[PDB]
Design a protein around this ligand. Structure first.
Ligand SMILES: [Zn+2]
Ligand SMILES: [Zn+2]
Ligand SMILES: [Zn+2]
Ligand SMILES: [Zn+2]
Ligand SMILES: [Zn+2]
Ligand SMILES: [Zn+2]
Ligand SMILES: [Zn+2]
Ligand SMILES: [Zn+2]
Lengths: 248, 248, 248, 248
């Protein structure tokens, strides 16, 4: 449960030390990318207030994916701020039933449900205060898993920021999943997708994945990974769950 | 986990010893009034299968009120049976946001969200194979709190059976409650209603309030109270909570 | 189809000459009350800009009732603006299903559905920029039918503004209606509700019911009935309808 | 207003000349595919009676895509029968908003909204009475466009039927469409998908697009294209629509 952490000029890390919750400050208003656990709600705004943003200053909420530890407070944040939610149809029906009936977890990770305001399509752009957010679909971890890119600045120099959802598969049945018949082929597109993302700075729903150390302060992003690296790691791990899995 | 327990020719208590779950067997389908806690879906069906009812058999699902311990498994149930859900507007909206944003409890007693299939109005009857269920709104415990009544036959003779919702108010602010300006006003009107219900037998979400010993055989409904008595003991505690409210 | 019509110092009519839609401007943002027909999203939006209110400025949307000729463009207004919708449970479920499955009209008037962001109980107050709006439930025309009250100033001289919903029953089955078993007792108390509203200035969804003439510019609401007169006039019309239905 | 039209042993066209509604009767309940125009609910139910399928015998509703002239009466059906709907994320959201905020038609084509009871992934199979229905996503005409393939038993002999959704882009802006950046990419993949469908018999939302003739009765589907032909024909038109588009 950290305090505001500058990543680039208009991008800050506002979610705890082991849970990315990105704040992108635009004149036209603020933007929240993920929000952590259902309980991290007021904390989120706290960092908002000190950051200069107030509830009515919250314009938009984007998600990496609609699970409880990453979209937990979306509903509470909407009630308490000026937030509207933009998500793909997949993230949207899932956000909407509170993470319930999860392809792989069922009801083991339900949060309170929220309604989406906008339905975005793969490669759709969202401009907030002259700041353009591009959506990159990467089905795998969830059918609606998404990647968000945007160019910020550091030294005045343009910095392309890729917010990549997990490429992980926490104990999933990959081959012949009747609930997700083409899981493997989706995940494989997703690896190559992240792999080619306009990436100067990468961040991930879990900071460990990108090698980020939010506790390291000015060093929190010194050994941080590349988009390519994290991709290939994630694949080595999947082909490693897919190998062992084959027989038995 | 208990075994079914006849109450009338076709009414059975398939819940637990501490959570009512009234199963009603009609020729052209079977009704379920409340289903207790969310984790009680297997048992609910378990109890149904062991009573001459498959998933294909659950035709209807009515509820006393949209709280976790009384409507928790309805989402799961629909997904596993051909069950439809009939409920009033107020319960329907609450069912749909998973028990979140509770007037009195907030997100403290959340559960998987479900969509109502039918919206019913005060005094509306639902007939499933010749059995008439008449809806009695009794706002208070929740805005949508209802009393479901129907005639059965015990030993082959008519038994008018009232499934009155909780008239309780665990930890509520009664007056000056901005989220429920007319609370006291509604609670009073409900007692008068709960008291004038066509009452031969009285069943309630929590067996205690009606005075029912579920795990005590056919002598379970021996110390069970009347409608009148239940609302009487209901107003008494309220008027004393309203009185204990001038303090704080 | 007209240009903005001022009612009070910060309260304008912006719909059409046959359809009411009120813009209430406050130091914290605009508040809209009904919107007319689905096709009117752009007109209303013109007027608001004419009035110095930009889309970002619309923050709240209130409704008399969720019929197509009054709640029509609400869904698009939500997409085109950051406004949020507040409504009671009945009006929230009827709005969410675009008007379909009407208790009396069925599916003959559907419009783009929408989600209420906030559900409100009877007598609940909402404050926008120091101004307070109070919801008065007046069930009948629709079971969600709401009267909205606030006070402005017509001469730097406080006027009580009452926006009350229709009290009509256009071809409604009154007594014996299975979709509305208690229609008669709701209307009745609804009359007695409208009658006693704080009401210097009265407005109705249909100008033609509270004797307004949006063309009359300077006067217009000068031969306009009072709340007592409206209320009384409806039950008169109402008590005429029942009479017929009964013996006739 | 056409009487049922036998397509195979247990597959009928119960719609109209111009629009395709398929009834697949199975040991365990009947399945329906598309319903046509919003007002077509009673006609279907009538045709369903003329085939021994009572409202309670309707179990599952499937969809090509959630446009008005194909999914129009799905909500009245769900209300008048014990039928449930299975659909993908894309379709389920468009259906949940009545065909409003269309990516290409906006809100000019609106119908009663309906909730999905089940969400399917690409290539997910749904069995009803031993009969297996497989979903093939063919994103294009709508993002949620789907093709359903089942195998009947014509005259004791199985048959491989293919209900492929429209593959048209009527008036669509194909290149650089803000709401649909990967449109063209999506279609190409969808042309491929239709081409290779298990396809003895091919049927389409609009009969003519697969050159059926519902007035031709027994003839009806005699000079009717093959999946292979249909697809490539659709790709052909798409190529001309594209190139012609690039030249302003
Ligand atoms: Zn996750
Ligand atoms: Zn995670
Ligand atoms: Zn409760
Ligand atoms: Zn309880
Ligand atoms: Zn109306
Ligand atoms: Zn009207
Ligand atoms: Zn279409
Ligand atoms: Zn069509």
């Amino acid at each position: 449960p950290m305090a505001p952490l500058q990543i680039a000029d208009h991008t800050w890390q506002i979610g705890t030390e082991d849970l990315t919750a990105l704040l992108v400050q635009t004149p036209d208003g603020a933007v929240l990318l993920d929000g952590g656990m259902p309980q991290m709600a007021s904390h989120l705004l706290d960092n908002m207030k000190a950051r200069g943003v107030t509830p009515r200053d919250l314009r938009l909420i984007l998600l990496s994916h609609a699970h409880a530890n990453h979209a937990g407070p979306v509903a509470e944040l909407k009630r308490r701020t000026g937030a509207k939610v933009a998500a793909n149809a997949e993230s949207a029906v899932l956000l909407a039933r509170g993470g319930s009936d999860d392809l792989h977890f069922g009801d083991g990770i339900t949060y309170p449900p929220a309604n989406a305001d906008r339905i975005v399509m793969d490669g759709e752009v969202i401009t907030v205060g002259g700041i353009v957010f591009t959506a990159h679909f990467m089905a795998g971890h969830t059918p609606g898993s998404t990647a968000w890119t945007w160019t910020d600045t550091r030294n005045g120099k343009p910095v392309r920021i890729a917010y990549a959802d997990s490429l992980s598969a926490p104990g999933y049945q990959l081959q012949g999943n009747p609930r997700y018949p083409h899981l493997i082929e989706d995940y494989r597109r997703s690896f190559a997708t992240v792999r080619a993302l306009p990436c100067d700075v990468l961040l991930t729903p879990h900071p460990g994945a990108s090698n980020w150390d939010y506790a390291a302060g000015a060093r929190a992003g010194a050994k941080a990974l590349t988009c390519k690296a994290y991709a290939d790691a994630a694949e080595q791990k999947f082909d490693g769950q897919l190998a062992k899995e084959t027989a038995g």
